[PDB]
Amino acid sequence: DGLWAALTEAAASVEKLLATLPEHGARSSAERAEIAAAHDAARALRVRFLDTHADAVYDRLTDHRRVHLRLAELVEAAATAFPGLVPTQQQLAVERSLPQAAKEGHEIDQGIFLRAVLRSPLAGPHLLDAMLRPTPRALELLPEFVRTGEVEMEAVHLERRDGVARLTMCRDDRLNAEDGQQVDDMETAVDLALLDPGVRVGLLRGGVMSHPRYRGKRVFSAGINLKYLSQGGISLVDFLMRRELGYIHKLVRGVLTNDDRPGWWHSPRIEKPWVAAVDGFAIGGGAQLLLVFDRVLASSDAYFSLPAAKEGIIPGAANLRLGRFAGPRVSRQVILEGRRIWAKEPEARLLVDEVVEPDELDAAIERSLTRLDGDAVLANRRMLNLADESPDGFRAYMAEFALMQALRLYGHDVIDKVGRF
Amino acid sequence: DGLWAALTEAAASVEKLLATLPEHGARSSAERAEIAAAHDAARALRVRFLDTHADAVYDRLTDHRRVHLRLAELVEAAATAFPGLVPTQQQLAVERSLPQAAKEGHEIDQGIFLRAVLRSPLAGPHLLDAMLRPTPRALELLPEFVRTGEVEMEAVHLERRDGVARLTMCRDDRLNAEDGQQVDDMETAVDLALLDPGVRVGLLRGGVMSHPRYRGKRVFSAGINLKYLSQGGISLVDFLMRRELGYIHKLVRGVLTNDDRPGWWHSPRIEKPWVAAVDGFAIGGGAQLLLVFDRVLASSDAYFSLPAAKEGIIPGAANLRLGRFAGPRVSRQVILEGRRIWAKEPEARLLVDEVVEPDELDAAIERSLTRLDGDAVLANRRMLNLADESPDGFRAYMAEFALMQALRLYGHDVIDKVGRF
Amino acid sequence: TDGLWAALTEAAASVEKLLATLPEHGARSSAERAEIAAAHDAARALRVRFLDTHADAVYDRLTDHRRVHLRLAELVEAAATAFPGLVPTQQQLAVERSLPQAAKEGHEIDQGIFLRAVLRSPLAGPHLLDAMLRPTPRALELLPEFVRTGEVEMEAVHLERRDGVARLTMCRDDRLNAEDGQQVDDMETAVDLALLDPGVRVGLLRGGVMSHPRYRGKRVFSAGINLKYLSQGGISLVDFLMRRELGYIHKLVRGVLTNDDRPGWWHSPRIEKPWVAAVDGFAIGGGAQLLLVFDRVLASSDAYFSLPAAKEGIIPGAANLRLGRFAGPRVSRQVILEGRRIWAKEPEARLLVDEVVEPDELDAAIERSLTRLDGDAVLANRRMLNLADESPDGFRAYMAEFALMQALRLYGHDVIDKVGRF
Amino acid sequence: AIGGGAQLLLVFDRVLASSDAYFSLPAAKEGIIPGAANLRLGRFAGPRVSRQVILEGRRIWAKEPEARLLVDEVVEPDELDAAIERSLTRLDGDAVLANRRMLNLADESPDGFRAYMAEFALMQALRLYGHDVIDKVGRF
Ligand SMILES: CC(C)(COP(=O)(O)OP(=O)(O)OC[C@H]1O[C@@H](n2cnc3c(N)ncnc32)[C@H](O)[C@@H]1OP(=O)(O)O)[C@@H](O)C(=O)NCCC(=O)NCCNC(=O)Cc1cc(O)cc(O)c1
Ligand SMILES: CC(C)(COP(=O)(O)OP(=O)(O)OC[C@H]1O[C@@H](n2cnc3c(N)ncnc32)[C@H](O)[C@@H]1OP(=O)(O)O)[C@@H](O)C(=O)NCCC(=O)NCCNC(=O)Cc1cc(O)cc(O)c1
Ligand SMILES: CC(C)(COP(=O)(O)OP(=O)(O)OC[C@H]1O[C@@H](n2cnc3c(N)ncnc32)[C@H](O)[C@@H]1OP(=O)(O)O)[C@@H](O)C(=O)NCCC(=O)NCCNC(=O)Cc1cc(O)cc(O)c1
DSSP states (O other): OOHHHHHHHHHHHHHHHHHHSOOTTSOOHHHHHHHHHHHHHHHHHHHHHHHHHHHHHHHHHHTTTTSOOOHHHHHHHHHHHSTTTSOOHHHHHHHHTSOGGGOOOTHHHHHHHHHHHHHSTTHHHHHHHHHHSOOHHHHHHHHHHHHHSEEEOSSEEEEEETTEEEEEEOOTTTTTOBOHHHHHHHHHHHHHHHHOTTOOEEEEEEOBOOSTTTTTOBOOBOOBOHHHHHHTOOOIIIIIIHHHHTHHHHHHHOEEOOSOSTTTTTOSEEOOOEEEEEOSEEETHHHHHGGGOSEEEEETTOEEEOOOTTTOOOOTTHHHHHHHHHHHHHHHHHHTTOOOEETTSGGGGGTOSEEEOTTTHHHHHHHHHHTTOSHHHHHHHHHHHHHHSOHHHHHHHHHHHHHHHHHHHTOHHHHHHHHTO | OOHHHHHHHHHHHHHHHHHHSOOTTSOOHHHHHHHHHHHHHHHHHHHHHHHHHHHHHHHHHHTTTTSOOOHHHHHHHHHHHSBTTBOOHHHHHHHHTSOGGGOOOTHHHHHHHHHHHHHSTTHHHHHHHHHHSOOHHHHHHHHHHHHHSEEEOSSEEEEEETTEEEEEEOOTTTTTOBOHHHHHHHHHHHHHHHHOTTOOEEEEEEOBOOSGGGTTOBOOBOOBOHHHHHHTOOOIIIIIIHHHHTHHHHHHHOEEOOSOSTTTTTOSEEOOOEEEEEOSEEETHHHHHGGGOSEEEEETTOEEEOOOTTTOOOOTTHHHHHHHHHHHHHHHHHHTTOOOEETTSGGGGGTOSEEEOGGGHHHHHHHHHHTTOSHHHHHHHHHHHHHHSOHHHHHHHHHHHHHHHHHHHTOHHHHHHHHTO | OOSHHHHHHHHHHHHHHHHHHSOOGGGOOHHHHHHHHHHHHHHHHHHHHHHHHHHHHHHHHHHTTTTSOOOHHHHHHHHHHHSTTTSOOHHHHHHHHTSOGGGOOOTHHHHHHHHHHHHHSTTHHHHHHHHHHSOOHHHHHHHHHHHHHSEEEOSSEEEEEETTEEEEEEOOTTTTTOBOHHHHHHHHHHHHHHHHOTTOOEEEEEEOBOOSGGGTTOBOOBOOBOHHHHHHTOOOIIIIIIHHHHTHHHHHHHOEEOOSOSTTTTTOSEEOOOEEEEEOSEEETHHHHHGGGOSEEEEETTOEEEOOOTTTOOOOTTHHHHHHHHHHHHHHHHHHTTOOOEETTSGGGGGTOSEEEOGGGHHHHHHHHHHTTOSHHHHHHHHHHHHHHSOHHHHHHHHHHHHHHHHHHHTOHHHHHHHHTO | OBTHHHHHGGGOSOOEEETTOEEBOOOTTTOOOOTTHHHHHHHHHHHHHHHHHHTTOOOEETTSGGGGGTOSEEEOGGGHHHHHHHHHHTTOSHHHHHHHHHHHHHHSOHHHHHHHHHHHHHHHHHHHTOHHHHHHHHTO
């Protein structure tokens, strides 16, 4: 067909130019234009190659869809089996060692790949199932958790108490600003909550902060770590896609288990209901999380925003979910124009179920946790979630997002805004 | 293959254990666990069998999709052609004779079956079309109804007047509590209204009650008959699925007719607009109905609830439809937490078009009926319904519902709640 | 092949024989009326059956197995010649166009049957929708002058590039911007220019100053479809009602499909931009429909929004598709099924309108809104939003049924009567 | 709460209602003056709603937004007993006494009350013997 050979050729011109030209930021305009054109030809061919060959490629890596691979494993195995399609671990380590501004944008190739995989009605669902399986880290910590009711992680403190999995986001120095480690901890904690049979409901809440401007106050989330993003430490795959397809999707659909229990034939996934309590504010990735909870409580003084309207990245799946909560006018006000929404305004009730004075909040949270216990809730939330968000809807969106977001992650406007934080 | 034989084997172990063990409630724990494990193995194999063979099975029963069979006929024919897949009429009669608490849960097998059928892009739409055809009972009563303008049925009084089919729900002793007979009446009445060419618009309204606590007052619906549900008299197929796929779906999409009139090529279905008027309250199945009308009126004092949040069954297709009316937050408040919504609160306007004082209501209902007459309305409501609810969306949901609801119908929590009413 | 083409050919001939022999439309007896109605019905039925099985093969003949993009007007013309009797010839249409709606035989209905069948196909459907997203020849031809001058005057639309904004002013000053086939052509042409012009970052749609005595000196957004023309037989199913939905309006949403002629085409085959609408006076019918696709909407304090023809009108475009998502099913029915008019100042205006402003504050609020929508973040976000809000299948499935439902309403007796009284 | 009972609500420090309740002064066409509602209602609801209620017999439901003009808390029948108990514990101190005395003094002057009751004494007497009233009342 010619496409693999043409791609291999275009990738080689890219490697030849990168080997011979000066470092990024010492390049002339002619040189900058030449490498940009080379990248463009190669990426174009990655797309065309995968438009026709994605299923065959995915079948090679997963043994015709009989081995579930998570994202990180999938893209690594794709790199070794299809050199030049997506970057090697080594090529990525060079990239990770640079600040965003200096990067070549190899992650974009991973966006191209994941787009093509998720677009497939065969490969797509299969990858999404892989990401709903429990993480190894969670399987390994599960017995100690069952025994102790407690796990301390770098970014999340998890405690079982009165049948509730209490996730406290506890990055006290930086307003629960998100990074790759927080995602790993979140997923790990979400997996433990779901697998633990002494947990009936989940609670997500921000912990007490220690930074001087917030000392002694709880804060839910200030969204993505902008410093790290500037410094090159936000991974397309291991942060931006992982969170969407992993813990966040697990909140919605539960964890896919193996056929190892009664009832698996009607409930292959273990799902539970989730309550979020918002102190201070929920910004960006933290606001995005609220679109997935069964119940949402907020302090009277809180606000909700997706602020990077002019020069930001796409706010995860908020573009997918927000409209269903707020309609297309408010969804655009919030996302396209950065409208911030306060707990006490009427439109907060589009996102938040209960708004309560700081001194009444603990007790309201506790009451809300008792209301979500039974099997009726489980069945009903499953049916509700199925109606709200079809698997195809989610998959289609995440397919385009994988590439759209990859591009935004390397947009000059973003790199500039982020560097000023 | 191997699956039909393995299923046949697992069903025989079930029949041997049922024949040899004591009656339900005289069984020991060891015996209870043994029969549960047998049921589980068999039901698992029903699922696996149908995952691969559902289309071939359905093709056998319907002559490769050239005979439309309704649900009751389809499951009966499946039982005789595929012994052990779904229960026989005989096995069901034994079940129906028992109270819910004592049943083996054979209807669950029917849930497995219907799930698999509705999941199929070929079988699914076909079965849905069969259930949109007119009922024989309605074809038989149609000429008398055209002549007389009047039919009295056990649970529903139907009257043609001024171009309006007035359905009055008239179970005056029990607040229009629903059962299998009511569904048969409702579908029959809906069929007549649609087929009768002197009917332009429908009206659904609760009749005057006679129970002492409501004497002389109209009441719309108190939802499912909980006594009958406890006593074993609520049929998964003939009540819970029949109403969703029959009269309720006919309110939305109309009756599928044979090619026997002009214009059939553009309008194979005869659809008309429907007005609902709510007196007293609409609970459960009655509240569910409101999500399908073109216009909804309520008395100032009325409320709307889907109350069985802790230990109830799934409220029909409310989990499918409610979100589009109220968004995800309110939809969860109503269904997950049992929030009841009053006619006079602002959020009633999400469900109700007009709220009127009891003494102004009759006249407001009459005016609403005159506003829905033309051909412009027919065309517009068709286009609106098509956008609001896709055929795939409906089908996918009813597929999962079929099994999810079957399981809830036999859940210990439900059986207990229902026994206390 | 399987008998359907022949049976259709036969039913079309009985139609022609009856039309050639019976008296003209308003001179027919009841027996005659009923005979020709029955003949039309048999033929139309067979058009549907024929296309239920053969639509892909038909569409493949006309487009060389989906390798040539044809727009609606070309597609239906080419179908008429390659499949006589399936859809009307240019000649048969000219006879129809020369009659008032009341006297027409309803040949456009056959085009509705055709387009329904095409759009229902998962292969032909998307391919036709892509054809309609391509830039119009008229726009490609005007593009260099537009890039040079920043200005184009058309019959129904004035277009001006200024401070990075494509300012579309609808300027049918004698008629409250009442819509017709020429307005659509102008609108699509202007939308195409705005999208293709690299010095345009954002669009603005606004009604111009009116000259009719009841509105002299006042801006008006839209009074919707030209009812006089509709009565007189001059509103085309294909060239007006489908063209606007699949062309400019869809381009406001999805952008213009270009050829592979620039960097980044592999991620962005379509050039899309954000759009602002500003509503003065009122937005009625087709004008109100347009508001369901803008990124920002501003209205004057005294404006209202309506889709008024609830009793005896045609379908209001894709409002039945889109309105529910904005207002929910109750309000959407109140507006469409019962003709509820919505005022800029009522709370429920906020379902449709982002900002409501006093007439003397409005120009400046429009200018501020245009500066807020500039970047690449907005482009990426609006794309992801539009993709979530309206799936390509959803849009297609709806437009498929609309093509026929609307064709029927275009020839409904009720409509023809209401329209004749205007 | 109807008539004289509705009138009483205009004098309490706290008012709770069940979700299903309503408030009316119904005898708009052929009734007597509803006590001091004509004096007090305007301060709670303004002159437009006050006339809607008294001149035209508009009935006001617990769950409608305007109920908040007359009622502090609206609660579901099963939550009501406990909400009543909590409201009682919030009104205990000496701060409350002092504040309610000052609030009452500002809301209704002794002259205002007295002037109104003076006209009411005769206006109501006349209504108590009006032919329209005697006819309505005889039909009940
Ligand atoms: C939250 C604030 C208003 C608080 O302001 P103040 O009250 O003035 O306190 P600060 O002292 O600024 O905050 C305390 C402390 O937290 C740290 N902090 C606050 N916000 C951040 C962020 N976003 N990153 C890192 N560190 C932060 C900052 O370092 C501050 O002080 P030092 O640690 O001493 O340097 C402010 O910090 C702020 O506006 N920050 C930037 C807001 C912002 O743009 N957040 C990112 C929005 N975008 C996303 O989340 C994008 C996203 C995330 C996803 O997960 C997925 C996806 O698809 C897209
Ligand atoms: C309506 C009420 C609040 C009124 O309270 P009161 O004024 O104190 O009335 P009651 O005296 O209890 O009722 C009057 C009268 O009606 C009878 N009544 C009222 N509702 C019912 C029901 N649902 N079943 C049986 N009998 C009933 C009640 O028993 C009395 O008759 P007697 O026992 O012979 O005296 C109350 O009666 C009540 O709680 N009713 C039950 C409400 C309920 O839980 N309904 C079921 C909700 N759940 C569904 O609809 C489930 C469903 C339906 C479906 O169609 C589909 C689906 O997928 C799921
Ligand atoms: C807008 C009004 C309420 C206000 O007008 P008034 O202030 O009462 O002054 P008028 O004298 O009526 O209007 C001034 C002027 O414009 C003319 N006018 C106003 N509206 C129209 C329309 N729609 N067509 C033609 N001419 C018009 C009117 O006849 C006057 O001109 P002269 O007769 O030349 O003096 C009135 O003009 C009116 O009632 N218009 C009809 C409203 C209407 O039905 N609009 C269309 C509704 N239906 C659709 O849009 C259908 C549609 C459109 C689509 O684009 C797509 C689709 O799928 C379906």
